[PDB]
Design a protein around this ligand. Structure first.
Ligand SMILES: [Cu+2]
Ligand SMILES: [Cu+2]
Ligand SMILES: [Cu+2]
Ligand SMILES: [Cu+2]
Ligand SMILES: [Zn+2]
Ligand SMILES: [Zn+2]
Ligand SMILES: [Zn+2]
Ligand SMILES: [Zn+2]
Ligand SMILES: [Zn+2]
Ligand SMILES: [Zn+2]
Ligand SMILES: [Zn+2]
Ligand SMILES: [Zn+2]
Ligand SMILES: [Zn+2]
Lengths: 282, 285
């Protein structure tokens, strides 16, 4: 319970400072990249081979897989600075502002601005400007800087609304067969964003564009973790009123007690975020 | 000390059949695939980025990485069957054979036959012939079945010889700066086979050909594990021979490479697997 993830808009200037600062040590030491590669590899790992499913997406493992990813990440954050926790970007309310692109979250004193078209959309403001922050594609080779493109598509021109979220929290079943994209009536698939997609989680990705728009190169952007803290919390919160599928008869690595490549972690090991050691602002 | 690792030519027919069975069981569950990916994963993980080194190859972590790779595999074989251990293929001895392809390892009751040129090289014999054994390519997707290409390359027509192993075993440094393909007088890069290459470890990867000849898909071939047990066995022997020489780099090497660094995709460090006895096994020698 006793470790609290706040709303970014609740953070003090010293917190945003410690966060942004602590994240650079991790990039520096070489531990942040481990997180990029785990996530990339999880996405190549299809369950089973020949399937749309992969270990970390497009199935029930989506939520636990990412829960453990953050938990593992936040612990590393702690080792550097014990006073730091993982914040959440509450995109669903940024979505109401006349111009979400203006949300404090994008301040040069935290993550940084939208991409600079004049530089083919390389972000050139904030701590993760190209030059200060290296990035790497899918082949696992340097790529030359973070690129953002706030609502540049037509598929995802806007962030998800409070009603998109509220309407997901209403789903009875954590997940249903066939435990994939085409999963009807399943809190998992809905939050993820495939029902009339992209929505919710998926939509946030496409909206930011840049690396974030591609699963193979999403963690290259720290927003990735703020986005997923909010996803995690949506679930966390779901978990109080409805408080997993499948248990068995899912593909291997989708069941309650299966291992989640690239780890030996199981859905069950992280079903109670408090037993993990952290809570949200609520 | 208790898991004894046996030469492939010392194996009984039930031993040959216990292993094969178990590997297939691991494959049936979905555990085998996890290993293939772990390896492809590590190879795309450069230390640092922009470098030719990855977490598993081309640098000092190549040796301890695979030790941890096989240790995990063996423990998985063992849970299926308390009796199975990881056999080693002593390829330095098959190299003396008039036609290495005749060796009992490639028997149809163990690993199976070389690729068959009538079918663009797909192995149609043994327990892992295409149809009884499914493969991925380098992007994660089904590929079409195991494929073997015995010494068909100009660069790697021969298996490495015992003389070749004896030269590695000669080196006094575990590795040297800069801890990559270019490290001179380094056991690691010698055994790996980059010194006037391909040699030793690489040579054998190339000689087999097919999946086994490419980093990202090598472990699609169960012989990958037979081959690295030998590599490990040779390293373990170098460790007794040079008892007062330890791993390098001890410190102030690329993160991912130092004595005490974690090894992607794992949290295990070289320092965890430096002595095979504690890990729980021995080679019959
Ligand atoms: Cu995501
Ligand atoms: Cu993702
Ligand atoms: Cu190898
Ligand atoms: Cu390899
Ligand atoms: Zn909300
Ligand atoms: Zn809660
Ligand atoms: Zn864990
Ligand atoms: Zn023996
Ligand atoms: Zn016999
Ligand atoms: Zn590469
Ligand atoms: Zn271990
Ligand atoms: Zn061909
Ligand atoms: Zn020994």
């Amino acid at each position: 319970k006793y470790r609290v993830r706040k709303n970014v808009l609740h953070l003090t200037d010293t917190e945003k400072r410690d966060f942004v600062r602590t994240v650079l040590i991790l990039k520096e030491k070489g531990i942040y990249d481990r997180y990029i590669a785990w996530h990339g590899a999880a996405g190549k790992f299809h369950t089973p081979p020949g399937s749309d499913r992969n270990a970390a997406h497009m199935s029930s493992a989506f939520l636990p897989w990412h829960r453990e990813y953050l938990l593992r990440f936040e612990r590393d954050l702690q080792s550097i600075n014990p006073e730091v926790t993982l914040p959440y970007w509450e995109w669903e309310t940024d979505a109401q502002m006349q111009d979400p692109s203006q949300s404090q979250i994008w301040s040069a004193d935290f993550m940084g601005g939208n991409g600079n078209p004049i530089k083919d959309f390389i972000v050139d403001t904030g701590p993760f400007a190209a030059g200060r922050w290296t990035t790497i594609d899918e082949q696992g080779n340097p790529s030359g800087g973070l690129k953002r493109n706030f609502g540049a598509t037509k598929e995802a021109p806007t962030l998800p609304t409070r009603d998109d979220v509220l309407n997901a929290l209403k789903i009875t079943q954590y997940d249903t067969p066939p435990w994939d994209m085409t999963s009807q009536n399943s809190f998992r698939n809905q939050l993820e964003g495939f029902i009339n997609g992209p929505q919710l989680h998926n939509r946030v990705h496409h909206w930011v564009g840049g690396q974030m728009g591609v699963v193979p190169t999403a963690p290259n952007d720290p927003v990735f973790f703020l986005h997923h803290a909010n996803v995690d919390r949506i679930w966390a919160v779901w978990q109080i009123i409805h408080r997993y599928q499948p248990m068995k008869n899912g593909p291997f690595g989708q069941n309650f007690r299966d291992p989640m490549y690239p780890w030996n972690t199981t859905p069950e090991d992280v079903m109670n975020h408090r037993k993990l050691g952290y809570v949200y602002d609520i």
